[PDB]
Structure 1
Amino acid sequence: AKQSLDVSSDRRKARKAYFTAPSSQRRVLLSAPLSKELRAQYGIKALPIRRDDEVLVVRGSKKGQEGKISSVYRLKFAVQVDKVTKEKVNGASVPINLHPSKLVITKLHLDKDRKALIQRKGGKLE
């Protein structure tokens, strides 16, 4: 249970802090777990998700479908992965919103800041 006197177990307070979270705070909310390979390879379990990361859907109707994320659509609290789209009846292709907690990251888009974030969380980076 909660022991501190600054964190809150109020439901109304906690849902307001979720649904009105700004973009930089929705980045850590929209985290995604890593695969069996990557957790073995780096030593970290989940990462705040980025655009050109490669994911595998492990839940829902699109389960088992691979792809690369085209957009982290933080206003809708969702990601849109390429190649996981919906055909409209008028030939169009709208993307399907996925929540990143139902994804699994299979390849990291790495730069210096992702590398620094892995070593900050105590990761191997190998």
Structure 2
Amino acid sequence: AKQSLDVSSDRRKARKAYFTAPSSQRRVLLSAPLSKELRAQYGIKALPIRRDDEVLVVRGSKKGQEGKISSVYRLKFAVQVDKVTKEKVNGASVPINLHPSKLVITKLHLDKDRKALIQRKGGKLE
């Protein structure tokens, strides 16, 4: 359990931390676990998701679907993946706001910041 005094376990404080979080903390919160293959690739379980990479959906009503992230809607703690949309009765399209805890990353978009992050997290990066 909670051993440090400087850690707190109040529900009210925790929700006030969660909903009032700044966006730089949110991309740390908006994290998705990698695949078994990507864990076999880099030796690492979960990562902060961004928009350029590719993912699959492992829960929800749209389970067993996949795609590249269109945009990360950090303000709603959510992430619009391309091609997973509800088509309205006008015919227009609106994506389902997914949540990265229910997602599994399939193909990473690797960058120098990303490669250095994998290196600092102990990754066996090729």
Question: What TM-score comes out, normalization by structure 1 length?
Answer: 0.99
Post-superposition Cα deviations, 1:23-61, rounded to whole Å, max 9, x if no partner, equal 000011000000011001000100000111100000001
Secondary structure of 1:91 counterpart: coil
Name the CA distance, whole Å, in 1 between partners of 2:36 and 2:3.
Answer: 34
Q: How much identity, in percent, do the aligned residues show? A: 100
Q: CA deviation at 1:119?
A: 0.6
Name the CA distance, whole Å, in 2 between partners of 1:17 and 1:65.
Answer: 32
Post-superposition Cα deviations, 1:61-88, rounded to whole Å, max 9, x if no partner, equal 1111010001110001000000101101
Q: Which runs of 4+ in 1 moved over 4 A?
A: none
Q: CA deviation at 1:109?
A: 0.7
Indicate the RMSD between aligned Cα atoms, in angstroms.
0.5
**Structure 2: which 5+ runs fail to align?**
none
Post-superposition Cα deviations, 1:82-107, rounded to whole Å, max 9, x if no partner, equal 01011011100001100000000001
**Structure 1: which 5+ runs fail to align?**
none
Give the length in aligned residue pairs: 126
Question: What TM-score comes out, normalization by structure 2 length?
Answer: 0.99
